[PDB]
Amino acid sequence: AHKSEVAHRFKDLGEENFKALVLIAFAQYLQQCPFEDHVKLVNEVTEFAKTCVADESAENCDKSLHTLFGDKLCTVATLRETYGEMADCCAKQEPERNECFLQHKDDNPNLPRLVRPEVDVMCTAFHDNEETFLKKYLYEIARRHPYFYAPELLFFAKRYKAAFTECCQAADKAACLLPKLDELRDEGKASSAKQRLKCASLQKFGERAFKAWAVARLSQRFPKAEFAEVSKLVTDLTKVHTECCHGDLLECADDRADLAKYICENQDSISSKLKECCEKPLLEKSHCIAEVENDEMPADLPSLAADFVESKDVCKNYAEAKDVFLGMFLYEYARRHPDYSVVLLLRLAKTYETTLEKCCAAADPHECYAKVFDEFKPLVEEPQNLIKQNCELFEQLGEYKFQNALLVRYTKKVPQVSTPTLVEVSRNLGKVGSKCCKHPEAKRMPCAEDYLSVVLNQLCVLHEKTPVSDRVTKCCTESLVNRRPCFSALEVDETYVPKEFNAETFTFHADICTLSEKERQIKKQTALVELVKHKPKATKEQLKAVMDDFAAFVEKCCKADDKETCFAEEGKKLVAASQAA
Ligand SMILES: C[C@](O)(CS(=O)(=O)c1ccc(F)cc1)C(=O)Nc1ccc(C#N)c(C(F)(F)F)c1
């Protein structure tokens, strides 16, 4: 092992990525902390790290990264008045302190909306002080996204920098800049959500849950690779994410760089698709390897029957190494089905596992588990149908109206759920329609189903913060694999007593005329969830009336050029109609 860990990571990562990764670590633990305080702390930690590189036996150079980083964070976090119960983490020592910070990560920090300033003013600040502009980005995203995959946030940290470098020198700065920023915002929300699911799996369901997931996905991605190679990649990938999820970001970034390096040096044994990625710089290389197209599978792969049902050693091999054998099953089933969602492949492996458990205790196990693959049929057909059915509804409704349909459905199922959580989750589910229905069938399932997992997990973690519905808690705690059907099965809450009516939540203001079309949609969708919470028995027919009427007076008052009287009177008609009943 290494004398001085901060020295080892400092020299392995280089100064620039060290400081950026420590700034993220700090920002993801103490989300409410001001930017300038975090930068000062990172500066001190970094100065110290440099004394350790020069001399590894200097005073505190042999402490853990968390002891070093923890103490520095607590110089500003022991402040209970301006923060809160983050002060109690500083009453603990490692490793209990880090565990405390991990458990206090807030998925919905009460933090200001991030308003985007004039392209002209953004561009001025960028040339003025480049480094600080980019630290500000790192900081703002990390405190709002406490599980953002740190190494990818650095890649995320290299691209807006490229965007600003290029677009601030363009003739039309805004035409260059905005679509690049819009695309980075969306893909960043997708990245965050994707990583929250990896962490939720690791932290709540264990390393074994995560590995089976990795075996399934990497076997689809690298179908030419040998099981022993996939297994090695799974081990290295699992160690990387366990570290980031456990707040060991320096180690996480280092072990990821090592893995991308390993992958590119063993390319002929992994995938035929890695060529271009492996010529890119470190950050875009790692990103490219992570998003790479599936390799084409080998041509005439055998049936899998002779290794997993017909063989006389099926029950013996399972007994002697349950986990690598099932891993082998998942490797072989998943390589052959890039058209199956990861979550479907994990269900198939569980059904095979539960079948061996029952049948390897029978008279002749072979006669018991003989028709095992036959039982996969309804498991396979079921996602296919939901997706066919749901994509058809999408085509006749369009994204926006599709979202509204889910808002109404999901509000009736679980009306106790926070309104901003219902809006976000339904809108994002509605984004499955756009992103996945555009595909031919055999590509649809992984796209639609694996993305639902990401979105339902957001629902689970947002609801976990302040739980309000036992049934959501149940679906969220029961399994990972069984989450989508546990949610689909939920029926309309009859027990739910309607909400009283509040004028304010259905009264709008002129400031809505200044918002983008999208924000204005989000506003109407918010009002729509509140409508259903007020009258949950209302018919789809009734709903569309108040919706179209909402649209007309938004239309009418934004073109009324008066004294907010438009948004007042039309907000008084709703207050009068309610006081009357
Ligand atoms: C004017 C400025 O505040 C310059 S800056 O203070 O150095 C800064 C840079 C990046 C930030 F995310 C926040 C603040 C700025 O660029 N702010 C800003 C605010 C919100 C968003 C968003 N979304 C952005 C963007 F660069 F990310 F678009 C930038």
Could you tell me if 66 and 25 lie in one domain?
yes
For residue 170, tell me if it sits in a domain: yes
Transcribe 238-251 into DSSP letters: HHHHHHHHTT-HHH
**Separation CA 134–CA 112 (nearest Å):** 19
Query: Is the four-CA dihedral 74, 32, 456, 486 of positive or negative sign?
Result: positive
Domain end point (choices 493, 526, 550) = 493
Is residue 5 annotated as involved in ligand binding?
A: yes
State both tokens at 492: 């309309």
Is residue 172 annotated as involved in ligand binding?
A: no
For residue 35, tell me if it sits in a domain: yes
**Separation CA 518–CA 492 (nearest Å):** 29
Report how far ligand 1's centroid is from the alpha carbon of 136 (Å).
Answer: 7
Could you tell me if 393 and 467 lie in one domain?
yes
Report how far ligand 1's centroid is from the alpha carbon of 103 (Å).
Answer: 29
Locate the ligand 1 atom nearest the alpha carbon of residue 114 and give its number.
20
Q: Which amino acid is at 556?
A: K
- Give nearest CA residue, ligand 1 atom 16: 122
For residue 555, tell me if it sits in a domain: yes
- Give nearest CA residue, ligand 1 atom 28: 116
Could you tell me if 361 and 453 lie in one domain?
no
State both tokens at 501: 């009516």
- Give nearest CA residue, ligand 1 atom 25: 116
**Separation CA 331–CA 225 (nearest Å):** 10
Q: Which stretches of 339-376 are DSSP H helices?
A: 342-359, 365-368
Locate the ligand 1 atom nearest the alpha carbon of residue 139 and give its number.
12
Smallest CA-to-CA distance from 344 within 432, 226, 213 is with 213
Domain end point (choices 458, 493, 528) = 493
Could you tell me if 480 and 511 lie in one domain?
no
List the determination method: X-ray
- Counts for the chain of helices (H) and strands (E), in that order: 27, 0
For residue 579, tell me if it sits in a domain: no
Out of 35, 36, 113, 114, give the residue to mutate to test ligand 1, the one with the largest number of ligand atoms within 8 Å of its CB.
114
Judge contact between 56 and 7, C-beta under 8 A. Answer: yes
Could you tell me if 342 and 249 lie in one domain?
no
- Give nearest CA residue, ligand 1 atom 21: 116
Report how far ligand 1's centroid is from the alpha carbon of 521 (Å).
Answer: 24
**Separation CA 9–CA 7 (nearest Å):** 6
Could you tell me if 340 and 320 lie in one domain?
yes
Smallest CA-to-CA distance from 422 within 394, 462, 449 is with 462
**Separation CA 456–CA 424 (nearest Å):** 11
For residue 309, tell me if it sits in a domain: yes
- Give nearest CA residue, ligand 1 atom 18: 116
For residue 578, tell me if it sits in a domain: no
Output Rg (C-alpha) for the chain, integer angstroms.
27
Judge contact between 150 and 25, C-beta under 8 A. Answer: yes
Report how far ligand 1's centroid is from the alpha carbon of 113 (Å).
Answer: 12
Could you tell me if 139 and 92 lie in one domain?
no
For residue 576, tell me if it sits in a domain: no
Q: Where does residue 492 rank: exposed (0-12), middle (13-18), buried (19+ CB within 10 A)? A: middle
**Separation CA 466–CA 478 (nearest Å):** 18
For residue 139, tell me if it sits in a domain: yes
CATH of the domain at 13: 1.10.246.10
**Separation CA 270–CA 273 (nearest Å):** 9
Is residue 243 annotated as involved in ligand binding?
A: yes
Interhelix angle 322-335/227-245, rounded to 10 degrees, is 100
**Separation CA 12–CA 274 (nearest Å):** 24
Could you tell me if 191 and 113 lie in one domain?
yes
- Give nearest CA residue, ligand 1 atom 15: 122
Judge contact between 10 and 56, C-beta under 8 A. Answer: no
Could you tell me if 340 and 390 lie in one domain?
no
Locate the ligand 1 atom nearest the alpha carbon of residue 125 and give its number.
4
Q: What is the 3-state secondary structure (H, E, C) of 140-206?
A: HHHHHCCCCCHHHHHHHHHHHHHHHHHHCCCCCHHHHHHHHHHHHHHHHHHHHHHHHHHHHHHHHHC
- Give nearest CA residue, ligand 1 atom 22: 116
Ligand 1 surroundings by CB, under 6 angstroms: 114-117, 121-122, 125, 132-133, 136-137, 140, 160, 181
Could you tell me if 122 and 170 lie in one domain?
yes
State both tokens at 145: 């996204």
Please report how many Cα atoms fall inside a 13 Å half-sphere around the Cα of residue 16, on the Cβ side: 8
Report how far ligand 1's centroid is from the alpha carbon of 134 (Å).
Answer: 9
Under DSSP, the state recorded for 564 is S
**Separation CA 545–CA 522 (nearest Å):** 18
Could you tell me if 386 and 478 lie in one domain?
yes
Could you tell me if 147 and 182 lie in one domain?
yes
Report how far ligand 1's centroid is from the alpha carbon of 122 (Å).
Answer: 7
Locate the ligand 1 atom nearest the alpha carbon of residue 164 and give its number.
26
Locate the ligand 1 atom nearest the alpha carbon of residue 184 and give its number.
27
**Separation CA 212–CA 130 (nearest Å):** 43
State both tokens at 513: 């005329």
Domain end point (choices 442, 472, 493) = 493
Q: How many domains does the chain have?
A: 6
Is residue 66 annotated as involved in ligand binding?
A: yes
**Separation CA 401–CA 409 (nearest Å):** 13
Judge contact between 274 and 248, C-beta under 8 A. Answer: no
Residue 494, phi then psi, degrees to nearest 5: -85, -25
Q: Which domain holds residue 236?
A: 204-295
Smallest CA-to-CA distance from 288 within 296, 298, 302, 278 is with 278
Out of 129, 137, 186, give the residue to mutate to test ligand 1, the one with the largest number of ligand atoms within 8 Å of its CB.
137
Instruction: Give the angle subtended at the CA of 433 by the CAs of 429 and 436, to the nearest 5°.
Output: 110
Is residue 104 annotated as involved in ligand binding?
A: no
Locate the ligand 1 atom nearest the alpha carbon of residue 181 and give its number.
28
